[PDB]
CSV table of N, CA and C in Angstrom, one decimal:
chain,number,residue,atom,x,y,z
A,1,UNK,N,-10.0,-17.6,-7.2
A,1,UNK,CA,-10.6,-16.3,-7.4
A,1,UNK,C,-9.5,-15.3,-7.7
A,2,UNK,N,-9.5,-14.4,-8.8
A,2,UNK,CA,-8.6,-13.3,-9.1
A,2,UNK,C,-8.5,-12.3,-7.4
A,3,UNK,N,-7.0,-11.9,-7.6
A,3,UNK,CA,-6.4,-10.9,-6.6
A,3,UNK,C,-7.0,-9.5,-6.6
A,4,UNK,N,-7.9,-9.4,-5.3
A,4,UNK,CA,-8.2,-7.8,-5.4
A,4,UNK,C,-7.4,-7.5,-5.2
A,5,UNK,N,-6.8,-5.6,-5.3
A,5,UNK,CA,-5.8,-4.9,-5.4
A,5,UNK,C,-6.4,-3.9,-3.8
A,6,UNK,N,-4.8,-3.2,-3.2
A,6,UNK,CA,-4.8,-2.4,-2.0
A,6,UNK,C,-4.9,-1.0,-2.2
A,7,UNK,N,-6.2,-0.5,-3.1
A,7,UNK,CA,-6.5,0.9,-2.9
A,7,UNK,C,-6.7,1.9,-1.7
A,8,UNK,N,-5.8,1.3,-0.4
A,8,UNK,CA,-5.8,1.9,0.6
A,8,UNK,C,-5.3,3.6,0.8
A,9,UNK,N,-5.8,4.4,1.3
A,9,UNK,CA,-5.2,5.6,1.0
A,9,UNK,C,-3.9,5.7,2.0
A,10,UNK,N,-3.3,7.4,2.3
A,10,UNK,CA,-1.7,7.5,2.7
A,10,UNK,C,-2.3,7.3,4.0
A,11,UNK,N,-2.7,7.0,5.1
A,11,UNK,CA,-3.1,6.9,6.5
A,11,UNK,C,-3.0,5.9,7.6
A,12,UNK,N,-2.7,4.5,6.7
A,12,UNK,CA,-1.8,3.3,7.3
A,12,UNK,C,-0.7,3.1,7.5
A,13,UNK,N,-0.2,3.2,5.8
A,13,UNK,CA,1.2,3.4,5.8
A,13,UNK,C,1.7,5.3,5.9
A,14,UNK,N,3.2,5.3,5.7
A,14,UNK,CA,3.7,6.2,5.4
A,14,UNK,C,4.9,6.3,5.0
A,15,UNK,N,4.7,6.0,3.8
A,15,UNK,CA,5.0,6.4,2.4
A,15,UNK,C,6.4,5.2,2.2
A,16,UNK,N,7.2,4.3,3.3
A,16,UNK,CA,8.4,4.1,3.5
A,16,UNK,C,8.7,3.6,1.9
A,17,UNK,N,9.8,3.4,2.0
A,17,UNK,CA,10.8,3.2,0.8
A,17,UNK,C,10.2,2.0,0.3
A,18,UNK,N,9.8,1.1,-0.7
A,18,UNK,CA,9.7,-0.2,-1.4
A,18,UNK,C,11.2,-0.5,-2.0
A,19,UNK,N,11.2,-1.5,-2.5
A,19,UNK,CA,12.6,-2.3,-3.1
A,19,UNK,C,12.8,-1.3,-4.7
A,20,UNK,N,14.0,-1.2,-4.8
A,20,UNK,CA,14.2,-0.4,-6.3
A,20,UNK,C,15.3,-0.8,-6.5
């Protein structure tokens, strides 16, 4: 079955840095 996506809003996380 296709990947649902994480439309989670800002209130779990917080905001930290991803890879760049």
């Amino acid at each position: 079955l296709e990947a649902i996506p994480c439309s989670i809003p800002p209130e779990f996380l917080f905001g930290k840095p991803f890879v760049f």
